[PDB]
Amino acid sequence: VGRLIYTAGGYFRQSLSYLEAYNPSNGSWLRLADLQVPRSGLAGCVVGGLLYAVGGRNNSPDGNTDSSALDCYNPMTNQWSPCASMSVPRNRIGVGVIDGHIYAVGGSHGCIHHSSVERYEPERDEWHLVAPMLTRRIGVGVAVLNRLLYAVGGFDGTNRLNSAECYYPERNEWRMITPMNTIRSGAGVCVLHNCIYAAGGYDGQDQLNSVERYDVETETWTFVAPMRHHRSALGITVHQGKIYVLGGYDGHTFLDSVECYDPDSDTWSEVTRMTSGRSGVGVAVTMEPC
Amino acid sequence: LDEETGEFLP
């Protein structure tokens, strides 16, 4: 089917503009068109086969600029095109897609910690604010399951969170769900099968390698096999029934390792390494560029 | 250092 794991931006010494794509079929990496502005703490997502880079921050030697930008990469043309900007800058944002619409969740702007949420309409090229979360969350994990939007963990400006909430679009309303077993900010959050996975993160004391998953039916969080590396501010995505985690920060170095979770065997294995270690990347999956 | 991301703040 020819889909790649795209990684956009990230941080190592400074915010980066790399766009690189990994092919699990042959293990190859491709460096593609750079982002127009270097961004870390951004989020990636895909709508209509187009890759989107949302929010983040340019942590440069001379500046610390939070981003409200929404930029669209087209694999057919290998070019970035700007889109309408969000209502507010959002560093360490969370992003989910429901029915072709992009939801931007939380994130930080200076010392402000957002509870606000806004929804992007690609063909109309418009952002609109929706109901804010019950909790302010930066470094929040966000995923979509059964057309419901989940915001998991993060940092409210005072405490790191094990809490999580769910957004029900037809009622424009947020509801708390079962809290995680572990306090997690900067975790990788994705959906695999009928479960929301929360991998890694920071509990206030150490970077985590534990992973727990939420069964939306039973409303319980259960630990699965831990990752090989402790990591927070990691990239995460799902590809053909497996979780891929990319990079992050383990408290010592910026990782380049890419681990892969197989739910059938409940095991993690390293499948490749990124061209360089980095944290705070935006990751998504779409067609290969040609 | 931002212990969650590894980023230098100043």
Query: Nearest-5° angle of CA A98, CA A100, CA A106?
Result: 50
Q: What ranges make up the beta strands (E) of A87-210?
A: 94-98, 101-105, 108-109, 112-113, 117-121, 126-130, 141-145, 148-152, 164-168, 173-176, 188-192, 195-199
Identify residues after which chain B is interrupted (C–N over 2.5 A): none
Q: Determine, for residues A251 and B7 on separate chains, whether the beta-carbon distance falls below 8 Å.
A: no
Domains in chain A, number: 1
The structure tokens 């409210």 sit at: A156
- CA A287 to CA A4: how far, in whole Å? 6
> Is residue A107 within 8 Å of residue A114, measured between CB atoms?
yes
- CA A188 to CA A198: how far, in whole Å? 6
What residues of chain A lie within 8 A of the CB of B10, using their CB?
none
Whether A59 contacts chain B with CB within 8 A: yes
CA distances from A136 to A29, A160, A165, A166, A211 (A): 37, 11, 11, 14, 23
Name A44's bridge partners. Answer: A53
CA distances from A106 to A21, A89, A96, A135 (A): 27, 10, 12, 9
- The helix, strand and coil proportions of chain A, stated in percent and rounded to the nearest 5, come to 0, 50, 50
CB contacts under 8 A, B 1-10 vs A, are 3-9
State the maximum Cα–Cα separation within chain B, in Å, rounded to a whole number. Answer: 16
User: Method used for this model?
Assistant: X-ray
Task: For A42-92, give the DSSP string.
Answer: -EEEEETTEEEEE--EEE-SS-EEE---EEEEETTTTEEEE-PPPSS--BS
CB contacts under 8 A, A 124-183 vs B, are 139, 155
Q: Determine, for residues B3 and A59 on separate chains, whether the beta-carbon distance falls below 8 Å.
A: no
For A85, counting Cβ atoms within 10 Å of its Cβ (0-12 exposed, 13-18 middle, 19+ buried), the class is middle
> Is residue A39 within 8 Å of residue A17, measured between CB atoms?
yes
Whether A58 contacts chain B with CB within 8 A: no
Nearest CB to B7 within list A40, A207, A251? A40
Nearest to A230 by CA among A204, A261, A206, A246: A206
**For A261, what's the count of Cα atoms within 13 Å in the CB-facing half-sphere?**
29
Cα A238 from chain centre: 11
> In the β-sheet with A173-176, what is the strand arrangement from edge to edge?
A141-145, A148-152, A164-168, A173-176
Dihedrals phi, psi of A156, to nearest 5 degrees: -95, 10
The pair of three-digit structure tokens given for residue A203, joined into one six-digit string: 């509990």
- CA A161 to CA A184: how far, in whole Å? 6
> Is residue A230 within 8 Å of residue A267, measured between CB atoms?
no
Identify residues after which chain A is interrupted (C–N over 2.5 A): none
Nearest CB to B7 within list A11, A155, A201? A11
Residue A77 belongs to domain spanning:
1-290
Q: Give, rounded to a whole angstrom, the gap between the first and last alpha carbons of chain B.
A: 9
> Residue A211 in 3-state DSSP?
strand
CA distances from A114 to A6, A135, A157 (A): 27, 8, 9
Nearest to A74 by CA among A156, A150, A19, A133: A19
CA distance A143 to chain B (A): 20
